Design a protein around this ligand. Structure first.
Ligand SMILES: CC(C)Oc1cc2c(OC[C@@H]3CCC(=O)N3)nccc2cc1C(N)=O
Length: 286
């Protein structure tokens, strides 16, 4: 019993051009994808929507968790679920359309979008921290904080997405989930704690500052979190790493954001700031 709309799988099929997997640029409907499904642009009730079409019973479990979590969690910095479909060939989740896609894609300037300014990145960092704070205050652990899970609306406001693996908040688990290049050491060992979301958020902050992905094989070092070491050893400077695709960054506020990222990335979970402290530091930054 939720306020979400039950759609016919056939209507979602019809409005996405039969789930046309080609990218939007070449005439299709595919906007992106991530582990459990493909995300399509649709048009329902005169409204643009995003339709995510999703092992086995575990997939139904992530569909149910996404719905249960979204019913309990509504906030300015969380993506809004509109409805779902379970009556056809496959499970679908329907959301408000995010015209600016994901932070990951906007940082890479995917499809030719202009680089995000430093002014916009600071607003995005603050928004995402506000969304995590809401989750934590409501005893939820996201478990998959990453730039692909921070969406951007019509005003480039950060909207946290993908609540399929979210947990009710420390304990251990037999099923270790998350994205390795963003995971805290205790999460890779099976610990479940909101302290891990802070670590993953530190990685997202490093992506915002540098414009670099969390992992790059043909790059060296391959993992972004390792720059914290290059810098502390005075081998490099955060300045050497600032994204060159901005014309408005200023050293002081960049260094304040790097300081927050550095505190988030403490290897010892108990030494990390909690989300309230992170929100505060990002507010003083601006
Ligand atoms: C709530 C999700 C389904 O909504 C979207 C997701 C997207 C996306 O997703 C990348 C990954 C996989 C799913 C996810 O949440 N993170 N990449 C690119 C564009 C996306 C646009 C929307 C949207 N609501 O318009």
């Amino acid at each position: 019993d939720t306020r979400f709309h039950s759609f016919s799988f056939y209507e979602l099929k019809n409005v996405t051009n039969n789930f046309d997997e080609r990218p939007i640029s070449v005439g299709g409907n595919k906007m992106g994808e991530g582990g459990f499904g493909v995300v399509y642009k649709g048009y329902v009730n005169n409204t643009t929507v995003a339709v995510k079409k999703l092992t086995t019973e575990e997939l139904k479990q992530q569909f149910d968790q996404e719905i249960k979590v979204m019913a309990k969690c509504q906030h300015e910095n969380l993506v809004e679920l509109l409805g779902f479909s379970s009556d056809g060939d496959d499970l679908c989740l329907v959301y408000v359309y995010m015209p600016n896609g994901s932070l990951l894609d906007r940082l890479s300037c995917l499809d030719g979008t202009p680089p995000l300014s430093w002014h916009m990145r600071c607003k995005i960092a603050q928004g995402a921290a506000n969304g995590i704070n809401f989750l934590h205050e409501n005893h939820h652990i996201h478990r998959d904080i990453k730039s692909a899970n921070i969406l951007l609306d019509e005003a480039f406001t950060a909207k946290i997405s993908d609540f399929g693996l979210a947990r009710a908040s420390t304990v251990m688990t037999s099923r270790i989930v998350g994205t390795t290049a963003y995971m805290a050491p205790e999460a890779l060992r099976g610990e479940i704690t909101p302290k891990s979301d802070i670590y993953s958020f530190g990685v997202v902050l490093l992506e915002i500052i540098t414009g670099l992905p969390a992992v790059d094989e043909h790059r060296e070092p391959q993992l972004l979190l390792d720059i914290k070491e290059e810098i502390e050893d005075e081998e490099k400077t955060i300045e050497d790493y600032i994204d060159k695709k901005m014309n408005d960054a200023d050293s002081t506020s960049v260094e304040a954001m790097y300081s927050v990222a550095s505190q988030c990335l403490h290897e010892k979970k108990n030494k990390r700031p909690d989300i309230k402290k992170v929100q505060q530091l990002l507010q003083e930054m601006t």
